[PDB]
């Protein structure tokens, strides 16, 4: 036997609220970045070439 993923997670990080919050702080960081990255990409996909990011070429450095 081994602990379910959650039980492992639990005993490492959520017994002590000090570790729990530490977690959350860490998590909030890591999360923000991937969300953005992923969320942004999704959004840009739906407007391909409609946004300046796509269009900068035309009048850039000759």
């Amino acid at each position: 036997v081994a602990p379910t993923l959650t039980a492992r997670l639990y005993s490492l990080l959520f017994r002590r609220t000090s570790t729990f919050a530490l977690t959350i702080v860490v998590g909030a960081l890591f999360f923000e970045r991937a969300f953005d990255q992923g969320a942004d990409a999704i959004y840009e996909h739906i407007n391909e070439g409609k946004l300046w990011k796509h269009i900068k070429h035309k009048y850039e450095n000759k």
């Binding site: 570790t19 530490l22 702080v25 909030a28």
Partner: peptide, 22 residues
């Protein structure tokens, strides 16, 4: 007692909070 180890993880949280959040 347990306060050092707990004060040290509370320490860390503030720090990572500021660092990140700010």
């Amino acid at each position: 007692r347990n306060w050092v180890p707990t004060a040290q993880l509370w320490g860390a949280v503030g720090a990572v909070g500021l660092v990140s959040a700010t």
